[PDB]
Design a protein around this ligand. Structure first.
Ligand SMILES: Nc1ncnc2c1ncn2[C@@H]1O[C@H](COP(=O)(O)CP(=O)(O)OP(=O)(O)O)[C@@H](O)[C@H]1O
Ligand SMILES: [Mg+2]
Ligand SMILES: [Zn+2]
Ligand SMILES: [Zn+2]
Ligand SMILES: [Zn+2]
Lengths: 97, 229, 168, 51, 84, 521, 107, 171, 58
DNA sequence: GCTCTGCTTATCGGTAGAGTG
DNA sequence: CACTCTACCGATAAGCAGAGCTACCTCTCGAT
RNA sequence: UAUCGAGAGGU
């Protein structure tokens, strides 16, 4: 197994201002994952065949406005668990105010 | 605007003492010869006595020190405490200049009085915490450095520089350059996560520690308890 | 890969079927709305280009790029060689020859005359210039959007357009 | 078994055999089933009557 | 729009400890990927060492974009920020 | 680099727009309808299409690619299904909010019981924050017990005149009591989810806003469940107790229970329904859909597994010290870490840490191959994973790792510039060192490695104080940065010498101690 | 300014916002026996003019919601009759700098 | 149908390209990558305006990879066809199933069922053409067609025409 | 604290989360706006032009 | 199993105003 | 013009339920 | 190279 980098160790790296190190610990050294999201509806509802080079969010009828994200696997899991309870957590890559 | 690692307890020398002892240390009288600067510590001792235009400077110096003493005694530190954490340890800067420039002796200083008063007064305008010409920025900058300026003026007074520390021109310009550089180094750096640092600095001692005290009292405060013990 | 100024369009509860592109009904899709925005956020009317306008811009841009590469010192087959890559040489050469044989107003003198004559949707303004016509009957057929606008002169427009049209 | 919650846990334990002294102590141990939720201190104190 | 003109910059003219650590690390990474180096490389060939040499000569070709709370920003080159 | 190439632009998340999933949207994103509670085809291997492990939901198997996206189990994110419910049920999380909305609007036509003509009510619509607006509105409309047909000549506001109920919550059920006109007899009827659903669909867009809801993202009838999103197997994996014995996740069983209970609601209203049975069977569908999401409902028994323990609902997955946020997102277990007993060393520099050889051969750092280190790194590769100073992997620009344990011709490897060599941990590598509890920032400081025999981590005695370490069994943790950027953060921000003075009290946190302090006197 | 002795009925208390643009303020006569702004711990609060407030917001590039706040019912806000949106400037002793200017905006 | 469109392209630059001609490299790279390519969303990007003066902006260094990301904003002449749009063309080939007509960048297929009945394919004629009595559609004939369908391959677009309507045909 | 209640209320009120906090970015695996993350790093095209011409991209 | 706070229900007047002699 | 007699909103408690309860680490044992 | 628990321990 791997050691637990717990919340108090997180706080220590915040105090150090070591943002790169903390990101790396919690991604490259753990559960970093790539997901595809729809640029319109913000859900992880994209069907992505990478050898065929084709992406589509069927709900939005969208094959062009599609982004990939690097997030913790446990974040992908959290968001799917919220969806299973009828909560829509929409991940957008641009602001609007 | 300072980083917690960059301050040390220093005494602000215009706060203690009687009005007589205060006047004895800081006032220079170019008229009364026995209340002027000693002649063996300066080269220009002859051209000093009687100069009313140079006495106007020394009056503006002493009036400022009196303002400081009044400000510190009536507004900031009513109970008279004069030892406080402040940046840039002035005692070390001076004793290094005394060693670097061999300020031993019994040697007359070539440092003229207007150089001291204008040098120090110009220093207190280069201690930039906040930059910008906006009226509010300049006001915030003056408030941010008010206490430190008093510490500086209380040390770098004409009489003390010449009689007590015995600085020459080379050493005095170095002290000014060093103070300015060390003050910049003592500013907190943007990006500093002072929230978590505050949280750990207060929380860590608590893990190792007829009015209520200790942890039960801390809990009453932080929880904003309605019925304290 | 390459994207544009129009963004957003986040999901709404109600769908829309006023979208299918029909040039007859002036439905040009989400990219070619009447009001566009430049790279500074400023509002701007859609820039639709007649065959004659487009011939001037493309030819000017290609020879201006060639001059800039030469530090500041004619033919379409030579002008299309300014582009980079055989795919670009192809599309540009095929586009110039098409414009070379269907641009009525082949100079900027006549083109600005047509510009002032016409200056009404930007799509129609480019169609009237690109498609030579004899009568009003032929214009409201090929461009069925001019139906309910109710403000002709159309005929003297077409007459001036056809008179301005140089021989070949 | 069907009531494993609400039932008390740890009443039976694997007999400690690390060393002889530890076996003797294990056979003479007692348990107060108060919990760990609700701190207090009173049942944890060495009461005079424990003498 | 958001960008603050050089003449109206109000933020500190010194490189911060956080800017220094990120600049050194970022530049080190770029050097190990064979980015053009702006100083002579003698005996010290580690990416971090070369990056520290460029820093000491004000030769790291990077710019700090300091965001202010309202979203506006000042670009400062590492050639112009003061290094202790 | 370990992710296969995708043409989609890589971006980060700048905004999260929360809301509810409409019934239409739940169906639009679904890749399969879930109808059959039998997980397996017929115990004849493979999963039953339309069942809870329909392969269209995604691949969790090393040898079967996903039948929806074509990707292996590593890339496949999982895809949702949908399950149509025979009868609308409450969302267990939203019952108390549904109750508040019912008391706000007319339970007949769906109009806000008060209008902008009412000055105080006109003040409440001014509130910019949706949550606060909803409360200010609800504080007014709760007591309005009649839908007014007329504004306060006759000017009509569109009201219907009906009296409003006094709504009370009773478990998963809402009861409304209308006071028939002095005092007479009041009749409390049940406010079914379906009844409330239809009333809610008649709320106007303008009244939807005044209630703090959102026409596109949080429409108030989406708090009633008519179609359930079925999460993919990635959310609810199976486990194998003894190689050939596999059990299902608590969520898989609970969705089976919802599916079974849904079928029995269809089996009643079409044939043998003794009424008092229709209410018992519909109530059971409400139960399974509620305890699937939240199994700590106060005042009623928990859903139980046949083993007797309570079911692990989704709500319990996310809360608490061990839940999804504090246990998997704010902190987590990490690679390139180590732990062992600590010892003191009078002959180490303040900023060093002595690292056992075995630990230094297990941990690694991926050094990029350049002209300046290719000779050095080839030597490490020849030494291999078991001899120090050595190396464990060679990483190509494509991402393919070469495992140096199984490469019998390691001497015939040629390193290309731009490749990476995962070499052993070596002297002066910066590492983050840490003793729990991590009470302040100098509980985690960067030390310079010194590789040493024997199995303890070695500390200079003067760093014991900030760590509050001693050597009576204490253990400490070591973390290895994996890039030029994170190495530099350790050496340039966290290194021991940078930490000698702490901002806590503008004074040092390290001094001379024990033997050296006794001896110096 | 209406000083009462014991209470003001909630029904009569509603006659207070029905009288704009004129402003009615109420004080219990007890609460005024001591002037609280004369206390050591209450530094001098000075209301900013509409122009001074704008100058403050631009210097910090601030929205109003990003300033520290003072409640309308705050004893010193009531003493000054602060209305929603108005800002006080507060000059204060400081043990690290001697003097520090704090700004609060009224809710 | 020609337009002026404001477009942009994200270019990622590897650190070995962090040299003295970086901006000029990106400007050439934009042109090589964008000119002549087709998308269903904008159409054919024919030529980029003011290529040698394009403002490439500053490159953002991507944390963890060292590479720099530029957003190169530009303005181009684009050509996209539309269903319903009438356009002129030049026929490239004639065959028993109709003819093919070059409308600028792309090629349009007109099938026999979208050709008026009196136009008869005559292979014996030299050169081969669809003929009538006063009509003549051979290779190189100016024709006016109506785009009745656009199909998108994201590489080349495919449009099917018709001259089976009023005012359409040879000109 | 109150993890699930916060998220239910956020859905029902269509809360927009601008992801400016430290915790947001930690849980999204993104460089947090703190310390070394409180600014962006750009490439200095002007300082690169002092290199010789043979260093130029081809 | 124990402390706290906020939120959801009864009691308290308290008036404040038409019905009254 | 002196009386009550009830419809109001205060201000009460008032009772209630739940939410929370240091960090990291080791090992054995039983049930599914 | 399982999961859920419990118990005993280390600093
Ligand atoms: N239950 C616990 N929870 C959290 N931290 C704990 C702990 N038990 C021990 N620790 C950690 O270990 C330290 C205890 O050190 P010990 O070795 O137990 C006593 P000391 O005060 O260092 O020495 P002494 O034996 O001379 O009195 C605590 O200060 C903390 O750092
Ligand atoms: Mg110990
Ligand atoms: Zn979508
Ligand atoms: Zn899949
Ligand atoms: Zn109604």
């Amino acid at each position: 197994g791997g050691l637990r980098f717990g919340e108090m160790e997180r706080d220590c790296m915040i105090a150090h201002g070591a943002a790169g190190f903390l990101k790396e610990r919690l991604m490259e050294a753990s559960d970093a994952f790539r997901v595809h999201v729809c640029g319109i509806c913000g859900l992880m509802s994209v069907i992505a065949n990478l050898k065929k080079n084709q992406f589509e969010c069927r709900s939005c009828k969208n094959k062009t406005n599609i982004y990939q994200l690097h997030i913790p696997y446990a974040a992908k899991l959290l968001f799917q668990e919220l969806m299973a309870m009828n909560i829509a957590p929409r991940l957008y890559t641009e602001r609007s105010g | 605007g300072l980083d917690g690692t960059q301050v040390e307890r220093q005494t602000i020398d215009t706060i203690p003492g009687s009005d007589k002892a205060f006047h004895k240390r800081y006032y220079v009288d170019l008229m009364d010869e026995k209340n002027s600067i000693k002649p063996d510590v300066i080269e220009y001792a002859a051209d000093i006595l009687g100069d009313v235009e140079l006495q106007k400077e020394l009056n503006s110096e002493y009036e400022q020190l009196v303002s400081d003493r009044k400000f510190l005694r009536e507004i900031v530190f009513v109970n008279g405490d004069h030892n406080w954490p402040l940046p840039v340890n002035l005692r070390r800067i001076i004793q290094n200049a005394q060693q670097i420039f061999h300020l031993d002796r019994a040697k007359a200083s070539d440092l003229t009085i207007p150089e001291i008063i204008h040098g120090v007064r110009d220093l207190c305008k280069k201690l930039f915490v906040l930059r910008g010409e906006n009226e509010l920025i300049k006001e915030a900058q003056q408030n941010a450095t008010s206490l430190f300026q008093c510490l500086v003026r209380a040390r770098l007074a004409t009489r003390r520089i010449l009689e007590e520390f015995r600085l020459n021109r080379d050493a005095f310009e170095w002290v000014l350059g060093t103070i300015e550089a060390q003050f910049q180094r003592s500013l907190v750096h943007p990006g500093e996560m002072v929230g978590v640092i505050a949280a750990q600095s207060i929380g860590e001692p608590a893990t190792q520690m007829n009015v209520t005290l200790g942890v039960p009292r801390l809990k009453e405060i932080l929880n904003v308890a309605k019925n304290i013990k | 890969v390459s994207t544009s100024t129009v963004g957003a369009r986040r999901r709404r509860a109600k769908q829309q079927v006023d979208d299918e592109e029909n040039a007859t009904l002036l439905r040009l899709g989400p990219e070619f709305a009447l009001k566009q925005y430049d790279h500074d956020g400023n509002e701007h009317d859609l820039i639709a280009l007649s065959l004659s306008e487009s011939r001037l811009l493309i030819r000017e841009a290609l020879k201006a790029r060639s001059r800039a590469r030469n530090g500041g010192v004619i033919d379409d087959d030579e002008l299309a060689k300014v582009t980079s890559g055989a795919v670009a040489n192809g599309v540009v050469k095929k586009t110039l020859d098409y414009l070379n044989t269907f641009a009525r107003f082949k100079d900027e003198e006549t083109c600005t005359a047509v510009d002032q004559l016409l200056h009404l949707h930007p799509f129609e303004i480019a169609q009237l210039s690109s498609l030579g016509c004899e009568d009003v009957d032929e214009a409201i057929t090929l461009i069925p959007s001019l139906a309910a606008k109710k403000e002709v002169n159309l005929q003297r427009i077409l007459d001036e357009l056809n008179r301005l049209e140089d021989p070949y | 078994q069907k009531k494993a919650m609400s039932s008390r846990a740890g009443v039976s334990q694997v007999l400690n055999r690390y060393t002889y002294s530890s076996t003797l102590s294990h056979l003479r141990r007692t348990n107060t089933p108060i919990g760990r939720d609700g701190k207090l201190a009173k049942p944890r104190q060495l009461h005079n009557t424990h003498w | 729009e958001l960008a603050i003109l050089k003449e109206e910059r109000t933020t500190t003219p010194y490189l911060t400890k956080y800017e220094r650590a990120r600049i050194l690390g970022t530049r080190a990474l770029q050097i190990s990927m064979n980015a053009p180096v702006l100083v002579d490389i003698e005996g010290e060939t580690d990416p971090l060492q070369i990056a520290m040499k460029e820093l000491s000569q004000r030769k790291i070709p990077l710019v700090i974009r300091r965001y202010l709370p309202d979203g506006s920003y000042e670009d400062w080159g590492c050639d112009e920020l003061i290094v202790d | 680099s370990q992710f296969p190439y995708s043409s989609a632009p890589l971006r980060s998340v700048k905004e999260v727009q929360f809301g509810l999933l409409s019934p239409e949207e739940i169906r639009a994103i679904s890749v399969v309808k879930i109808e059959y509670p039998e997980i397996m085809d017929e115990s004849r291997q493979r999963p039953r299409e339309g069942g809870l492990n329909d392969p269209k939901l995604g691949s969790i198997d090393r040898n079967f690619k996903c039948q929806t996206c074509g990707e292996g189990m590593a890339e496949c994110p999982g895809h949702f299904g949908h399950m149509e419910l025979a009868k609308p049920v409450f969302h267990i999380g939203f019952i108390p909010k549904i109750k508040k909305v019912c008391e706000c609007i007319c339970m007949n036509c769906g109009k806000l019981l008060l209008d902008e003509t009412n000055p105080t009510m006109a003040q409440a619509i001014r509130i910019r924050d949706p949550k606060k607006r909803f409360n200010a509105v609800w504080q007014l409309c709760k007591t309005k017990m009649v839908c007014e047909a007329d504004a306060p000549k006759v000017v009509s506001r569109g009201g219907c005149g009906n009296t409003q109920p006094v709504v009370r919550k009773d478990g998963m059920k809402l009861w409304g009591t209308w006071k028939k006109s002095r005092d007479a007899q009041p009749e409390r009827k049940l406010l079914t989810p379906g009844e409330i659903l239809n009333v809610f669909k008649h709320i106007s867009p303008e009244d939807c806003f005044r209630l703090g809801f959102n026409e596109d993202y949080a429409r108030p009838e989406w708090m009633i469940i008519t179609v359930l999103p079925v999460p993919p197997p990635q959310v609810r994996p199976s486990i194998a107790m003894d190689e050939t014995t596999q059990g299902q996740d608590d969520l898989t069983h609970k969705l089976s229970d919802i599916l079974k209970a849904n079928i029995n609601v269809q089996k009643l209203e079409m044939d043998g329904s003794p009424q008092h049975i229709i209410n018992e069977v519909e109530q059971l569908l409400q139960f399974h859909v509620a305890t699937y999401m939240d199994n700590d409902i106060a005042g009623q028994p928990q859903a139980l597994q046949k083993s007797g323990r309570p079911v692990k609902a989704i709500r319990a997955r996310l809360k608490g010290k061990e839940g999804r946020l504090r246990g998997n997102l704010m902190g987590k277990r990490v690679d390139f870490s180590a732990r062992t007993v600590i010892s003191g060393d009078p002959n180490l520099e303040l900023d060093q840490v002595g690292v056992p050889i075995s630990i230094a051969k297990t941990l690694s750092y991926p050094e990029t191959v350049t002209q300046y280190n290719i000779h050095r790194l080839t030597e490490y590769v020849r030494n291999g994973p078991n001899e120090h100073p050595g190396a464990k992997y060679v990483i190509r620009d494509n991402g393919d790792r070469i495992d140096l344990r199984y490469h019998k011709r390691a001497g015939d490897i040629v390193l290309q510039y731009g490749w990476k060599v995962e070499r052993h941990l070596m002297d002066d590598d910066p590492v983050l060192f840490n003793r729990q509890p991590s009470l302040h920032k100098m509980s985690m400081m960067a030390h310079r490695v010194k590789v040493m025999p024997y199995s303890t981590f070695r500390l200079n005695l003067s760093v014991t104080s900030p760590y509050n370490a001693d050597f009576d069994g204490d253990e400490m943790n070591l973390h290895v940065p994996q890039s030029e950027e994170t190495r530099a953060e350790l050496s340039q921000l966290c290194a021991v010498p940078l930490q000698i003075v702490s901002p806590q009290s503008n004074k040092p946190v390290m001094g001379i101690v024990q033997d050296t302090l006794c001896g110096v006197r | 300014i209406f000083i009462y002795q014991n209470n003001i009925t909630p029904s009569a208390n509603k006659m207070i916002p029905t009288v704009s643009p004129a402003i009615i303020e109420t004080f219990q006569e007890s609460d005024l026996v001591v002037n609280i702004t004369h206390h050591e711990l209450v530094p001098k609060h000075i209301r900013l003019s509409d122009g001074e407030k704008s100058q403050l917001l631009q210097r910090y590039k601030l929205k109003e919601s990003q300033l520290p706040r003072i409640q309308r019912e705050d004893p010193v806000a009531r003493y000054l009759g602060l209305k929603r949106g108005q800002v006080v400037k507060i000059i204060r002793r400081s043990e690290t700098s001697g003097r520090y200017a704090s700004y609060r905006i009224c809710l | 149908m020609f337009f002026l469109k404001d477009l942009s392209l994200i270019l990622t630059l590897h650190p070995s390209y962090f040299g003295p001609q970086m901006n000029q490299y990106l400007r050439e790279k934009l042109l090589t990558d964008v000119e002549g390519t087709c998308t269903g969303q904008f159409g054919y990007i024919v030529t980029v305006l003011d290529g040698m003066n394009i403002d490439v902006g500053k490159g953002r260094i991507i944390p963890g990879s060292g590479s720099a990301e530029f957003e190169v904003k530009y303005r181009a002449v684009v050509w996209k066809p539309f269903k319903g749009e009438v356009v002129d063309a030049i026929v490239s080939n004639v065959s028993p199933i109709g003819f093919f007509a070059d409308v600028g960048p792309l090629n349009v297929f007109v099938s026999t069922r979208l050709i008026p009945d009196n136009l008869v394919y005559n292979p014996s004629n030299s050169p081969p053409a669809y003929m009538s009595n006063d009509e003549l559609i051979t290779k190189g004939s100016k024709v006016r067609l109506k785009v009745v369908g656009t199909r998108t391959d994201v590489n080349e677009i495919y449009a099917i025409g018709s001259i089976k309507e009023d005012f359409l045909g040879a000109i | 604290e109150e993890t699930v209640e916060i998220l239910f209320e956020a859905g029902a009120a269509a809360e927009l989360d601008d992801c400016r906090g430290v915790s947001e970015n930690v849980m999204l695996g993104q460089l947090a706006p703190m310390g070394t993350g409180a600014f962006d790093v750009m490439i200095d095209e002007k300082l690169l032009t002092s290199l010789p011409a043979d260093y130029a991209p081809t």
